Amino acid sequence: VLLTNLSEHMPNDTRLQTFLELAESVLNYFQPFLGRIEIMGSAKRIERVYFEISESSRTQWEKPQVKESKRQFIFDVVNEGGEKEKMELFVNFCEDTIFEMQLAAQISESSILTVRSALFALRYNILTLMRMLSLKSLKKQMKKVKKMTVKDMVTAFFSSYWSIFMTLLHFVASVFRGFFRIIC
Amino acid sequence: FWKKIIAYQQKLLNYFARNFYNMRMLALFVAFAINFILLFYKVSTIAVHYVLEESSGYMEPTLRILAILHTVISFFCIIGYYCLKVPLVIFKREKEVARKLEFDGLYITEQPSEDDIKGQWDRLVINTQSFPNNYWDKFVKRKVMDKYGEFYGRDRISELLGMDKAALDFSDAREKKKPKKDSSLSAVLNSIDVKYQMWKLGVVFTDNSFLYLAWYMTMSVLGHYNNFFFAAHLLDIAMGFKTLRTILSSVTHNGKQLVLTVGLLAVVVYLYTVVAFNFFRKFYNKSEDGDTPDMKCDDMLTCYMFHMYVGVRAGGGIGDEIEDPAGDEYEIYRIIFDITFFFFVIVILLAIIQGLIIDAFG
Amino acid sequence: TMSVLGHYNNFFFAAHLLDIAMGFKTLRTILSSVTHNGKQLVLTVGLLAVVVYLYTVVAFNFFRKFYNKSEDGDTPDMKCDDMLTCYMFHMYVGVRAGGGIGDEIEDPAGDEYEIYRIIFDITFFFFVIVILLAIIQGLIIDAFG
Amino acid sequence: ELRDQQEQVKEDMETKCFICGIGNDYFDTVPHGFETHTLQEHNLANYLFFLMYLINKDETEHTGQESYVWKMYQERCWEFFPAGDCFRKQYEDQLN
Amino acid sequence: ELRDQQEQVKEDMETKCFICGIGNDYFDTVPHGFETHTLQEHNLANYL
Ligand SMILES: Nc1ncnc2c1ncn2[C@@H]1O[C@H](COP(=O)(O)OP(=O)(O)OP(=O)(O)O)[C@@H](O)[C@H]1O
Ligand SMILES: Nc1ncnc2c1ncn2[C@@H]1O[C@H](COP(=O)(O)OP(=O)(O)OP(=O)(O)O)[C@@H](O)[C@H]1O
Ligand SMILES: [Zn+2]
Ligand SMILES: [Zn+2]
């Protein structure tokens, strides 16, 4: 807190900057627990205030129901509220939230299968496609197409994508079978 | 030898990639022509048959040729998509996984969430020698080694990313290696990354647009077996026209709200069926003759189906289709029943649907 | 030309009442609601035609027995024995019906396809009658806004 | 009306600070200035945490600022909340 | 249209002074400055 106050009130001091890199680890550790606010101080002057925020406090504030309460409060003050009582409403909401947080802290005492099936089917079908594609039959294909034979090259070109489409159909059928098995 | 084959194959790939969109438009036009012809079937009756009204006589061969052409165009559309848009998907996936590896250590620190198909499948590609094939940054493995090698283990990172430990050092010390003939066999088998191709096939199979085009091809193929399967290709107008997409965005903008409104309608009609089944069973006789009574509310499921099917579609509610309440001791209760049904199910919930559509437009 | 034709047949003078659209600023403002989204309205009509065509395909392939529109049993008037006839029947009758085609086709009770036909009628009512007409209304109201 | 109210709530939050009310245009002179101000300087969550800290802290252990804010909260005087002014606006010339 | 007109009336009253027309942003430099100006300095009731 001392170092953060000094850094924020001495923004152009390299001598303090060096201390900041030296204390980078401690400051990084304490960043979640350090809370900063600004107030209109006793000297008719705006002042920074640094305080401690508890881990339990942070968790209870980040609880989803507290977030829903915050959203409802913001909606209420923005739509059905004025600037005269805005801070009064904010303080009342803060008090209610603090009480709920404290009560929750007191009372707090202490899919994958279908993904696996789809992955296994992908593996099996693509492995079958790779097995049928990569073979010693290239010599037989050459023996068919000795010469140029644009017709043969185009036929093989279309056959490759037909095989890809058939593999996709087999994979889709396997996925459907797996889904039926898991639901039954 | 293979230079000319590769040149011709690349020429065909580029042609299909260039003409991908034009072939989609041609497929839509051929589907429209096929359906215009299909408007000319009649039933002839033993098994019945579907016969064209061959006023000119050329409709049957034209339909057969159009079906063949549509199937060929669908196959060419699949090929063109693979040539054109698959590389973009591969580039996006490679970029995403490389950035997750380098800036988050996905497979170094936190591991996939065990329910993310994308991460579980992308675990395969990291080991491949062609990991950033479409992504420009070829130094991603080196960057990950530099960032995470100091603590997590150099050898372990090398195993994770599939790169050799001291191959470069050994080659610099002494290479003593010789090349191999290209025309000789296995020169293609040893030059293809089977694991990378496996990952690519997996991601393109999981791609949504590729699946849609495969469904299009399958329906086109089924159209030869039964010609009416070509009618399913008219659904492509939704995905083909920007203005039609803008119009359908009104429906699809609040689809969740529409579905929940339908569910609420089902629940309130179920409550009305409970009330009718417990108090108004005598009024649900839907038989003209008095000899045989057709009671539509003697069973709870039958009454619920009757309400859903008839009262919702009726202009004035269930009261339009159930017996007149005049002269009964429950006349006032039944009038309230019918009026509230008309006000809630017919007037309000349908108004909720209309308002959802109009609010989506706005 | 229409005024000249009005002497030959006096009812051609009725075509001159269309000039109120081009004559009144307030009427032009009112018709601007229709004409602002005319392309969207035409495309919505086309989409309605396409979806009704799909429904006619389904009915012609599975629900031909229910399209008898004859009171007497001696002479059957089948409205879906021909694809074009079924399409015209759907467009002309089911769209104009309050509850869809199910208001005008045979009762599905007691049939083995009862559930499928109930789904058919309910989906027709929801899409053609409830949604697409709502799309037209929303287009007009959005043009006003 | 509900949709417009939600949009208005979003806009009056994305364009103004909830505490001081200074618009985002003033804070956006520094890059990310508005979000930095709303998440580090005038965070309503931080104000709630400060109120809770004051309530749970013993009265005798309060510092000068803590005692001042605590007395003002006890009297329900909310003048200590920065209204129309902030640290940056107070020390504009010193910082930049 | 009626709802939008009511909202516009509310906004042009919550953001400007009815008499001088100076926006609330100028007066809000002082805390509660706009309401103080509209209820003590340029009150239309006071003018009446
Ligand atoms: N005093 C303030 N405190 C916090 N945020 C503020 C404040 N004033 C204005 N804002 C603005 O509020 C925006 C987000 O606020 P808020 O936390 O309510 O939104 P959210 O995305 O719904 O939050 P959450 O992550 O809790 O769901 C910020 O981007 C910020 O610009
Ligand atoms: N010249 C002005 N006189 C009074 N109020 C003004 C003037 N100019 C702007 N205003 C604004 O008008 C707002 C309220 O005005 P007005 O008295 O009409 O509202 P109201 O809440 O309907 O009043 P009432 O209490 O009489 O029902 C004030 O908050 C103020 O900011
Ligand atoms: Zn602020
Ligand atoms: Zn004034």
Coordinates of C-alpha atoms in Angstrom, one line a residue, chain B residues 32 35 38-43 48 50 53 226 228 231-232 234-235 237 243-244 246-248 251 262 296 305 308-309 312-313 350 353-354 357-358 361-362, chain C residues 39-40 43-44 47 50 53-54 57 60-61 64 81-84 87 98-99 102-103 108-109 115 118 121-122 125-126 130-131 134-135 137-139 141-142:
Chain B
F32 CA -35.7 -24.8 -59.6
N35 CA -39.1 -28.7 -59.3
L38 CA -42.0 -32.0 -60.8
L39 CA -45.1 -29.9 -60.7
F40 CA -46.3 -32.1 -63.6
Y41 CA -46.5 -35.5 -61.8
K42 CA -49.8 -37.3 -61.4
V43 CA -50.7 -40.5 -59.5
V48 CA -49.3 -46.7 -57.7
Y50 CA -45.9 -41.2 -60.6
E53 CA -48.1 -35.2 -68.0
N226 CA -37.0 -40.7 -55.8
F228 CA -39.2 -35.6 -55.0
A231 CA -37.5 -30.5 -53.5
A232 CA -35.2 -30.3 -50.5
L234 CA -35.2 -25.3 -52.7
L235 CA -34.2 -24.7 -49.0
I237 CA -32.6 -20.1 -51.3
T243 CA -32.3 -10.2 -48.9
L244 CA -34.0 -13.5 -48.0
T246 CA -32.3 -10.3 -44.0
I247 CA -36.0 -11.2 -44.0
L248 CA -35.5 -14.5 -42.2
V251 CA -37.7 -14.9 -37.4
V262 CA -44.6 -21.9 -27.7
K296 CA -62.6 -36.0 -27.1
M305 CA -54.2 -33.2 -28.2
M308 CA -53.6 -28.1 -29.0
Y309 CA -54.8 -29.2 -32.5
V312 CA -55.4 -23.0 -30.9
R313 CA -56.1 -23.1 -34.7
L350 CA -50.1 -14.9 -30.9
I353 CA -45.2 -13.9 -31.5
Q354 CA -46.2 -10.9 -33.7
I357 CA -41.1 -10.6 -35.0
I358 CA -41.7 -6.8 -35.2
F361 CA -37.2 -6.1 -37.4
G362 CA -36.9 -2.9 -35.3
Chain C
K39 CA -39.1 -5.9 -52.3
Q40 CA -39.2 -7.5 -48.9
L43 CA -39.6 -11.9 -51.4
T44 CA -41.8 -12.9 -48.4
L47 CA -40.8 -17.7 -49.6
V50 CA -41.8 -22.1 -51.7
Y53 CA -44.8 -26.1 -52.3
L54 CA -42.8 -28.1 -49.8
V57 CA -44.8 -32.2 -51.9
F60 CA -48.8 -35.5 -52.4
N61 CA -46.3 -38.1 -51.2
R64 CA -53.3 -38.0 -50.7
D81 CA -54.0 -36.6 -57.0
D82 CA -52.1 -34.2 -59.2
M83 CA -49.1 -32.1 -58.1
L84 CA -50.2 -28.9 -59.7
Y87 CA -50.3 -26.9 -55.1
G98 CA -57.9 -19.3 -40.5
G99 CA -56.4 -22.5 -39.2
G102 CA -56.2 -28.6 -41.7
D103 CA -59.4 -26.6 -41.6
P108 CA -57.0 -37.3 -39.2
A109 CA -58.6 -39.2 -36.3
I115 CA -49.6 -37.9 -35.4
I118 CA -51.4 -33.4 -36.8
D121 CA -51.4 -29.2 -39.9
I122 CA -49.9 -27.6 -36.8
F125 CA -50.7 -23.1 -39.3
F126 CA -47.6 -21.9 -37.4
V130 CA -48.9 -17.2 -38.0
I131 CA -45.3 -16.3 -39.0
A134 CA -46.7 -11.7 -39.1
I135 CA -43.6 -11.0 -41.3
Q137 CA -47.4 -7.0 -40.7
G138 CA -44.0 -6.3 -39.3
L139 CA -42.7 -5.1 -42.6
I141 CA -45.1 -1.4 -39.3
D142 CA -41.3 -1.1 -39.7

